[PDB]
Design a protein around this nucleic acid. Structure first.
Lengths: 180, 50, 262
RNA sequence: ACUACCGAUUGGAUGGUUUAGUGAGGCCCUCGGAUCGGCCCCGCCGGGGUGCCCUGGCGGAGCGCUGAGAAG
RNA sequence: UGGUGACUCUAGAUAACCUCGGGCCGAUCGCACGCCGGCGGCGACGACCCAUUCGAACGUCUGCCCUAUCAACUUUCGAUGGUAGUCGCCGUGCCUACCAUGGUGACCACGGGUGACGGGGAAUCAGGGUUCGAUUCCGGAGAGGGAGCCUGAGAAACGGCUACCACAUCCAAGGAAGGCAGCAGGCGCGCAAAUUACCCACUCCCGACCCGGGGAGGUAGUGACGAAAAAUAACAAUACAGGACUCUUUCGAGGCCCUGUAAUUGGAAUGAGUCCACUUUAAAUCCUUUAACGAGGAUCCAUUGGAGGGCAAGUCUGGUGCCAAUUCCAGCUCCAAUAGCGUAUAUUAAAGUUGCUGCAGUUAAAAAGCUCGUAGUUGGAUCUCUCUCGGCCGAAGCGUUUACUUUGAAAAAAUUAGAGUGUUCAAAGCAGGCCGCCUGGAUACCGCAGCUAGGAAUAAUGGAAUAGGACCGCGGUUCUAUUUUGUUGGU
RNA sequence: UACCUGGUUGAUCCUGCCAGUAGCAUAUGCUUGUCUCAAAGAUUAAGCCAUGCAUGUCUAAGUACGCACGGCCGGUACAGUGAAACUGCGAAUGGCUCAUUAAAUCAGUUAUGGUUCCUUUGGUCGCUCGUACUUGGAUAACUGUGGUAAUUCU
């Protein structure tokens, strides 16, 4: 007996057929578009989408006024809207079955740092977050895959402690400036 | 019968092992001879053999 | 085992205690006492995990050993003493009084009461019997025996009893049209009015209760505690008045409170 | 030369059912009675009601009455 | 008296009994002292009995893998039942005495096997299933193997005792002591598994106890079992190469853009490391926070496998033998996943190759000479609520009995499903949120069997045909009213 | 996501098994920078164990003539702290393993109207018609003499 929990989950699925050209090319498309480190981030987002689709299908097998359908559909729709993947005017479960991996890829912190003009590229965005220059609200966030909510979209900025931000010069610049 | 047969074979193996391990370094056998080799020049061998 | 077990694992503790998984291997393990193990709140869980007067069990012992804690008017120094339904906890250093009555979700409320309401308690009578020299005795739900009860008091009635003297002050019979709180099963904590009692000989009777909104639910007769006469309760009730809201209405009231306050 | 079967020797050793016999150790019962103590008797003896009795310490024997009780 | 669905219950009354190995009826200890020698306030400890709590132990109903190359078993020696007792905490062949001859079995008894502790659960997942569950929760069992006790409320206790069997330690040889399937650690076994560390600070347990103790438990150490996040570069200019757009029929021009590739230049950003200080903690470590140093081949250098027969991936090179074809060896190039990637074995999915869902049997694995022929399995059509006593209702018989369907009660947590919640994200956790206050710690699922009250289609079953069949009244015979013969004897 | 690729013929379709593939377990090889959690002598041998530790315990409140310490006030029995020892309680929990065990265990359901129960909590505790302003003998710790090679022996 120990005061430990052993509850833990794999968060991705390896595909059944390893070598098919269309899936490889589409994965490479997404990796290049979004600056992902490897195929496993594609598999991770694909997994969360598959989970959400299974939940929506099992809710849709229920009859229309079933209270579990109303409660759990409202919760699922509210969460998908809250991370900005579904529009607010599309609170219908069937629209969940229309989504794509690219939406949850657009809601990453890497992509939102790229689209807000703090970075010159998507790879510059991953590097910018990973090196403690990006802060959401007033919290330094180091994780590229941090999914940004709609109330947190207008609050992504530069760390008040970063050289590009508040302004203490970095290690290289302070080394070079003291040579002369 | 399976339990008894396994016990018989285990007794055979353990008595053979006990005889062989008893031979080395005991009263009826030759001393256990040990070679100490220091594999660096920073190792103070007289400290270890003390 | 070769004799009584003395330990309680945390994951085997009662769920309504609300203990978390990773604090320890063990749960506080109530002592033997006036309430069952699965239906009690030990004093350490109340005074640490609910009221947060103490942060560890050691200073729960420090609060107890100063004789600042009373259950039903008596100084209880044991930190795992089993307190249960309708118990009146008095802390006169802070000048606070509590009654251990259930939530609508089946957990022991932190329910603050008036010092005037701390004087009495309601006990469900559990057996009546005649002892030597023809003396009527009454055994309640928290192991009290009262000599010479009123002859009108039968089993399953509720007695209002005075904590200082230990003598019966009043009683309520088990009738229809009469107010009860559920003390077990899936409907635990709900408060309503008795409407029916379908008797099953050699088996368990089932009592039908109607909520203040019109919701109807049944329980076993052992799960019924009469708490008022007719429609008005004889004690203070907690915030939720025994009306179990559905999860949709819980979500709606939570969002309405967020929108109004914030 | 190697691989693998059969196999006299009741070969020796061990085990599981059982026939017959023995059976350690504990527990119960019927005894037993090594020791220890009191009561009774006497002696050294203190006071009173005035030699009747008892008061308290030690010693002496009595298979007298016994009570507790180990080995077996 | 009081109770239950039902007592030989509880309470009452009488006659007594009441075990010397003996049942209660207080020769106990603390703290404050005060009233009119006598009266006393708080406690502590003991205690017969009854209740309660924590159980425990016996039973009820239903439910388990493989085997017929196990078809009859139990019964003298208890197997099934009866009566009386013994013993036990109690019900009981538990045991004894005497009777009865019973009890179980193809609906698989009895016997044997299992690489069998059982569940909660795990993997897969359209669904049905298949496989796993030694293992932290619950229940069982054991302490080398058997056996028997002591103390106690509780043990057939092994970190108690007494024997025997198997092992084994010390010895002055007479004697003495033993039991890691506790925590470490060792040997052995093997394909296969960590430190003879620190602490009661946390969680809780025990004791006379706020104070002592705890290899339970916590903490570090080893740890690529496994799961989470996540570096190994980014940008600018320059030079070539593409692709757009303006102007030209085009060639072409674009200080017109955009995108790539560099033995090209350039300083900006930083961790990995090294190392003060805090913080952490029982004391530490780690993390988190912060000084200082810390990057150009940023040599601070990513691996593991596979490809020239098919899923991704070759028109390649050099040695070496054999008769240009051709055995062995070292490379290049490409592809895949990536701080991970191969292999063996088992197992599951593809798999409808075990088939209920859902397979087959002319010629491919496979349907028998033919008929008769138990059990079992299956079976045509048909049939549209009341009687009494107490306040229009409650009690009572239910109506043939079932199988089926539904409802209600009740049914550990953890796990799973799922609600809420910026753990910096997540895997998690059960927390948190706002200027003392405001909150959460939801909810579902939970085969079958059993209780509960409805439904009456579907499928069984029964109800009058030698009528000794219903419904009525008239009865006759036998037994029988608890009272309407003040108190009574009553034929 | 109810998914495919290949293998018997000169060539075609089929049956049929297999190989690849994916998951889960064990092992193992090569490689390994950061950080969070985290299984871990089950499988074979319920095999055998060196050494150390794993179970002890005192309040105002059972017993204090150990100066082992320590103030009074002095006839005041005992200030106070208190080792040892007697007494009480615990050691029947916890921890380990899975050998046994196949209607046994175990789960759900029921029963004790067929039983016991330390403790906690409540009741009962002048309900008996019959030296007490306090009873008796011991025994530890302690002092002292010892035995045996040897023990938590005495």
């Amino acid at each position: 007996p120990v005061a430990r929990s052993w509850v833990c989950r794999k968060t991705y699925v390896t595909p059944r057929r390893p070598f098919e050209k269309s899936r490889l090319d589409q994965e490479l498309k997404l990796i290049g578009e979004y600056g992902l480190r490897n195929k496993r981030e594609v598999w991770r987002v694909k997994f969360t989408l598959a989970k959400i689709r299974k939940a929506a299908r099992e809710l849709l097998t229920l009859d229309e006024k079933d209270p579990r359908r109303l409660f759990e559909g409202n919760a699922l729709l509210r969460r998908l809207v809250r991370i900005g993947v579904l529009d607010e005017g599309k609170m219908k479960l069937d629209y969940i079955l229309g989504l794509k991996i690219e939406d949850f890829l657009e809601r990453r912190l890497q992509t939102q740092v790229f689209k807000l003009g703090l970075a010159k590229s998507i790879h510059h965005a991953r590097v910018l977050i990973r090196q403690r220059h990006i802060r959401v609200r007033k919290q330094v966030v180091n994780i590229p895959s941090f999914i940004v909510r709609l109330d947190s979209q207008k609050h992504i900025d530069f760390s008040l402690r970063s050289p590009y931000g508040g302004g203490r010069p970095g290690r290289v610049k302070r080394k070079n400036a003291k040579k002369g | 019968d399976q339990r008894h047969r396994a016990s018989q074979l285990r007794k055979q193996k353990k008595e053979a092992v006990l005889a062989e391990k008893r031979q080395l370094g005991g009263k009826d056998g030759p001393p256990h001879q040990v070679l100490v080799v220091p594999l660096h020049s920073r190792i103070s061998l007289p400290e270890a053999m003390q | 085992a070769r004799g009584p077990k003395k330990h309680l694992k945390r994951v085997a503790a009662p769920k309504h205690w609300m203990l978390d998984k990773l604090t320890g291997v063990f749960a506080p393990r109530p002592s033997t006492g006036p309430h069952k193990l699965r239906e009690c709140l030990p004093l350490i869980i109340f005074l640490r995990n609910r009221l947060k007067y103490a942060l560890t069990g050691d200073e729960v012992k420090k609060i107890c050993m100063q004789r600042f804690i009373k259950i039903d008017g008596k100084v209880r120094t044991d930190i795992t003493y089993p307190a249960g339904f309708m118990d009146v906890i008095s802390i006169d250093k802070t000048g606070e009084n509590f009654r251990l009555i259930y939530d609508t979700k089946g957990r022991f409320a932190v329910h603050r009461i008036t010092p005037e309401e701390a004087k009495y308690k309601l006990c469900k009578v559990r057996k009546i019997f005649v002892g030597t020299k023809g003396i009527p005795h009454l055994v309640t739900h928290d192991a009290r025996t009262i000599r010479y009860p009123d002859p009108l008091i039968k089993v399953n009635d509720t007695i209002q009893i005075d904590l200082e003297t230990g003598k019966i002050t009043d009683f309520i019979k088990f009738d229809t049209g009469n107010l009860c709180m559920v003390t077990g099963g899936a409907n635990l904590g709900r408060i309503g009015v008795i409407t029916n009692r379908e008797r099953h000989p050699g088996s368990f009777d089932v009592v039908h209760v109607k909520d203040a909104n019109g919701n109807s639910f049944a329980t076993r007769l052992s799960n019924i505690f009469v708490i008022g006469k007719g429609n008005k309760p004889w004690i203070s009730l907690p915030r939720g008045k025994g009306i179990r809201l559905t999860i949709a209405e819980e979500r709606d009231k939570r969002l309405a409170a967020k929108q109004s306050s914030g």
